[PDB]
């Protein structure tokens with residue numbers, strides 16, 4: 023019967039954890055138990071035993087300012103404040119970070135660290151970040167916020183561009199990164215040592231940077247999340263191609279803008295950018311192209327190891343040494359997007375941070391989700407940001423607010439959204455929407471929630487969709503159903519020759535997946551590919567087990583069927599960059615030309631059928647630009663690559679069609695269930711319960727549209743019958759060769775009869791009947 027741990031939970035409650043309380047009495051414990059302050063004895067008011075949980079609840083006048091208390095029994099233990107108690111005493115509502123005045127002559131600087139003994143700012147040269155220029159102690163307020171005003175006293179007349187860190191004493195000096203840092207010094211993770219473990223923050227004034235007429239998107243037809251066609255692009259990928267060697271630097275915001283007309287023409291409404299906030303593992307001074315085909319040890323990074331939640335990465339800047347440049351550059355890009363009638367969605371990664379020490383150094387036992395002993399819960403050798411905790415929630419909501427208001431960002435995609443409490447994300451949305459009425463938010467709603475050990479909460483995951491109409495979630499059900507997904511990637515599915523229950527395909531096309539309840543189409547982000555896992559092309563190739571050279575058109579015919587189904591489904595439409603042309607993550611490396619042993623290459627999947635270079639990367643976060651570059655020749659050079667450019671034009675046409683009628687962008691489940699019909703019922707003609715062909719009717723507000731998809735490897739008769747024979751009076755606008763809104767006078771891959779259609783194998787047909 024020994025004292026293990028101790029936590030003060032409120033003004034008059036200390037919780038002492040023991041190994042056991044069996045056979046010991048309230049009277050025997052009151053005897054041995056004694057409480058002490060910062061050495062004096064505190065009057066012990068009462069104890070209550072929780073024998074089950076093996077802990078005493080101790081009552082007394084345990085006023086915080088009489089230091090932490092330490093509990094005696096037999097060994098002693100100093101009490102720690104619980105995160106709920108730290109919120110009670112130290113939750114701060116005011117401005118955080120460092121704020122420049124108009125002429126840069128002063129800075130107002132705040133940092134939250136309620137258990138710090140002292141907090142010194144260390145200031146480094148703007149023209150050389152390694153050189154220490156000045157230091158200043160900060161003054162702690164009532165709520166544990168450390169403040170200072172930088173001015174003439176430190177010998178600097180203009181602070182803009184100067185860098186800073188915070189040395190924090192506890193007992194232990196540790197140097198930390200202002201979590202509200204608005205920009206940073208050029209960052210190279212190879213400079214990390216024991217003393218400085220992070221990027222240095224930077225004195226900048228966002229409001230004075232970039233286009234001062236920046237404003238939110240002006241998207242036509244856009245009346246909600248259902249009207250969104252999202253396009254997921256990585257800033258490096260989009261311009262890392264060698265063929266672009268004919269204005270702005272490689273793989274930067276300024277480069278990205280030069281290829282916006284493409285996306286304007288492609289028809290997408292929103293460009294979703296992979297994490298543009300600062301991430302840890304990089305050398306931002308090395309912009310050189312990696313030309314070798316590899317899946318490890320590349321300066322390339324998707325950006326899923328977060329360093330800052332407010333400060334942009336230098337990697338996408340032309341001038342990474344100028345901390346103001348990022349902000350002006352990203353604003354320039356976002357402005358350029360808005361002029362093209364489109365919007366931005368920023369991928370944001372709050373679920374975890376690059377290194378636990380990033381926030382744990384600032385204030386131990388607070389920012390992260392925790393185990394019952396105070397130990398921080400971790401993910402990826404990184405900290406799990408516990409966003410039920412007030413100041414952790416602030417980091418998320420304030421950054422959302424800041425990015426929304428300062429960069430005129432139109433939406434956000436939350437990585438591993440199910441790691442967070444619903445409440446944090448709901449507030450995030452509410453605040454972001456308050457700034458921008460047209461705010462759109464999506465996220466990965468995988469049921470992954472961990473939280474604080476013994477404290478369950480509603481997570482921001484798929485099951486949350488019942489009880490909000492705010493944030494939408496990726497539909498892995500439609501993904502898995504159409505062409506397989508993690509963990510069982512490669513399994514033949516609807517467009518890869520494996521028969522699927524047509525009722526569940528039809529329900530998915532209505533934005534009603536089988537694995538969670540979507541009571542509004544806007545709850546569902548429909549997708550078949552993303553940056554994660556194999557690309558659409560590669561998964562198709564693997565699933566049908568064929569070589570991409572020989573089966574190219576077989577694979578592309580199947581790929582176009584996937585895009586047709588996503589782009590004519592209800593809910594929010596999502597397109598992975600390259601999915602439009604047939605992008606591949608082929609491992610064209612000599613040492614991997616044929617299968618190898620046990621000893622596999624990193625993050626690669628094998629296709630047997632293929633002889634030459636059989637390895638394809640399914641997790642390209644650490645892969646070269648050779649693996650990760652968007653192929654512009656494949657996407658726009660009709661002459662050189664007729665098959666991929668056909669798939670591209672086809673995908674464009676489908677987007678055009680989707681935007682041109684609200685038959686595919688309905689608002690409620692009520693009207694979807696009424697106006698979206700299943701033409702191919704089980705039994706009608708050749709149709710089995712599980713099958714590889716399906717067709718459905720929709721109606722906009724009164725043009726009827728009918729989408730037919732034969733994913734079978736043979737031709738198939740679709741029986742219209744009494745109910746749908748009226749379709750024959752309409753006209754074809756999508757066929758084997760082309761997609762759009764104009765009628766096709768000589769359609770291919772389909773034949774019409776008195777009351778039926780004979781559709782070619784691996785072919786999609788769409789008919790319009792205006793009225």
Ligand SMILES: OC[C@H]1O[C@H](O[C@H]2[C@H](O)[C@@H](O)[C@@H](O[C@H]3[C@H](O)[C@@H](O)[C@H](O)O[C@@H]3CO)O[C@@H]2CO)[C@H](O)[C@@H](O)[C@@H]1O
Pocket residue numbers: 468469470498507508509554555
């Ligand atoms: O970070 C790990 C992976 O996270 C993502 O995978 C998701 C899947 O996309 C999602 O379908 C879900 O898969 C589980 C599935 O729903 C469940 O029924 C099955 O029994 O277990 C599956 C676990 O694989 O959740 C996972 C993550 O938990 C992401 O797609 C992938 O890239 C990541 O590697």
Ligand SMILES: [Ca+2]
Pocket residue numbers: 286287288289674678
């Ligand atoms: Ca177009």
Ligand SMILES: [Ca+2]
Pocket residue numbers: 148149150183343344345
């Ligand atoms: Ca500089």
Ligand SMILES: [Ca+2]
Pocket residue numbers: 487488489490491492540541542545
């Ligand atoms: Ca809902």
Ligand SMILES: [Ca+2]
Pocket residue numbers: 303319320321322323643644645
């Ligand atoms: Ca890397």
Ligand SMILES: [Cl-]
Pocket residue numbers: 551552556557558559598599600601602605
């Ligand atoms: Cl893809």
